[PDB]
């Protein structure tokens, strides 16, 4: 909870920044990414707190500069699949990845941004069918013909037009 001058004998490694590491600052262990911070600790403070009680910053005991601590796990992931006993291939939607050119499991071969996240494993088609598997933000997916997962913009309905006239009626 405070700066300390009595410690057990463990080790003193170098600082690893911009990388998810297992840290140990004055006995406080945890995992996260250490980055340089624009925070000024008041010399009686060793750790910082967020709106929760999570330790989001720390004062390095050797070089007295504040380091931010952020979790290295982040970003929503969704799986797009047809049925089991229909196919085994899947498409993965990474909601918080901008792959328009990563934090993805596999780079695949099909990549395009959908405004609901990065879609990997489904090829874009210019056709507009009805929705089969809803992806989000106007994008749907289906298992369509050799069979593959395709992603498309959903169609709102049949295109129509009414021949409006000021002297014609339809009975």
């Amino acid at each position: 909870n405070a700066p300390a001058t009595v410690c057990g004998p463990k080790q003193s490694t170098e600082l690893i920044k911009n990388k998810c590491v297992n840290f140990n600052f004055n006995g406080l262990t945890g995992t996260g990414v250490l980055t340089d911070s624009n925070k000024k600790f008041q010399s009686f403070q060793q750790f910082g707190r967020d709106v929760s009680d999570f330790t989001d910053s720390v004062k390095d005991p050797k070089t007295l500069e504040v380091l931010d601590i952020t979790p290295c796990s982040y970003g929503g992931v969704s799986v797009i699949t047809p049925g089991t006993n229909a196919s085994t291939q899947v498409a993965v939607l990474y909601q918080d990845v901008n792959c328009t050119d990563w934090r993805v499991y596999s780079t695949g071969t099909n990549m395009f941004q959908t405004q609901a996240g990065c879609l990997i494993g489904a090829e874009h088609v210019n056709n507009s069918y009805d929705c089969d598997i809803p992806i989000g933000a106007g994008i749907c997916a289906t298992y369509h013909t050799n069979k593959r997962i395709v992603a498309y913009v959903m169609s709102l309905g049949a295109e129509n037009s009414v021949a409006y006239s000021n002297n014609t009626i339809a009975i």
């Binding site: 980055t35 929760s52 909601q95 989000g136």
Partner: peptide, 25 residues
């Protein structure tokens, strides 16, 4: 979220604790 820690964004704090908002279809 990594480059804007000092902003203390509420969405970053929500998403670092596993709370995501899904877009409408």
């Amino acid at each position: 979220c990594l480059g804007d820690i000092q902003a203390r964004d509420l969405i970053c704090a929500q998403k670092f604790n596993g709370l995501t908002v899904l877009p409408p279809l």
